[PDB]
């Protein structure tokens, strides 16, 4: 049992189209947290009702230190309400506005954090997250959290984190999350994804054909990573262990492998 007059409410941290996203506190506990308000009308509007059921069942289930933890949930009259974590340090995509990109050391321990989280969920099943920038969240020691399980709250920024298997059309993997995670690596070191243009068109043809560049600032471990993991075809994409163990990621992270 939960109900909404358990909750002081505080400020939106994020407003969406599917939902809000507050900040909030247990009455009794006084314990800080997220409550992320779901309007049944724009749910049945999208089909996703009992495709959200199941994200809300994943994301219950997962206890990962990397993965936003879902502790309950409970409905209203017309409304999904889901008691969610709170990370106090906001989104990476935010961090990396301000810093521009980050060195070496943050990114592959970023790098590591995601890469044990999505191990975890490959685990148990879980083929696929997304893990955007503004899909990760930052925890208050700095640890980087997957938040998206549905309906997120967020210049060719659709297309850019996208493998080739999918704007194809093809079927696709669990080395999808390989690729996000060459896209991210790159996105860190440099301040820009790898295949950012002007048209969607364009992006589409550099995901596609798979071409990008490096700044001459990126070291050869770092390009080798990269190049490792953006591969067209996903069955020569390296597992989530070889990444893990990849001899930049162990040279330059802080979280241990
Ligand atoms: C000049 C511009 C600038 O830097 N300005 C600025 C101004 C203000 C701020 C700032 O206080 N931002 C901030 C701080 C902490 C959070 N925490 C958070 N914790 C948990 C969240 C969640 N957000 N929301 C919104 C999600 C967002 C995405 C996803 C996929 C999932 C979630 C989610 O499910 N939960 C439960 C959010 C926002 C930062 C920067």
Request: include cysteine; hydrophobic fraction near 35%; charge should be neutral.
């Amino acid at each position: 049992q939960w109900a909404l007059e358990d909750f002081e409410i505080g400020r939106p941290l994020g407003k969406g189209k599917f939902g809000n996203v507050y900040l909030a506190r247990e009455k009794q506990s006084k314990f800080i947290l997220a409550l992320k308000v779901l309007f049944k009308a724009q749910l049945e509007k999208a089909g996703v009702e009992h495709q959200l059921r199941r994200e809300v069942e994943i994301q219950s289930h997962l206890r990962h230190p990397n993965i936003l933890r879902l502790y309950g949930y409970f409905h209203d009259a017309t409304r999904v309400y889901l008691i969610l974590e709170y990370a106090p340090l906001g989104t990476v995509y935010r961090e990396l506005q301000k810093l521009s990109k980050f060195d070496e050391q943050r990114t592959a321990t970023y790098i590591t954090e995601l890469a044990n989280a999505l191990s975890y969920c490959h685990s148990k099943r879980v083929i696929h997250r997304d893990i955007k920038p503004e899909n990760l969240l930052l925890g208050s020691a700095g640890e980087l959290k997957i938040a998206d399980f549905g309906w997120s709250v967020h210049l060719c920024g659709t297309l850019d984190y996208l493998p080739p298997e999918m704007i194809e059309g093809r079927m696709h993997d669990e080395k999808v999350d390989l690729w996000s995670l060459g896209v991210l690596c790159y996105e860190f070191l440099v301040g820009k994804p790898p295949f950012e243009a002007n048209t969607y068109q364009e992006t589409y043809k550099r995901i596609s054909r798979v071409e990008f560049t490096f700044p001459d600032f990126v070291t050869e471990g770092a390009r080798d990573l990269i190049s490792r993991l953006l591969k067209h075809n996903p069955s020569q994409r390296p597992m989530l262990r070889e990444v893990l163990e990849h001899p930049w990621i162990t040279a330059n992270s802080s979280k241990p492998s």
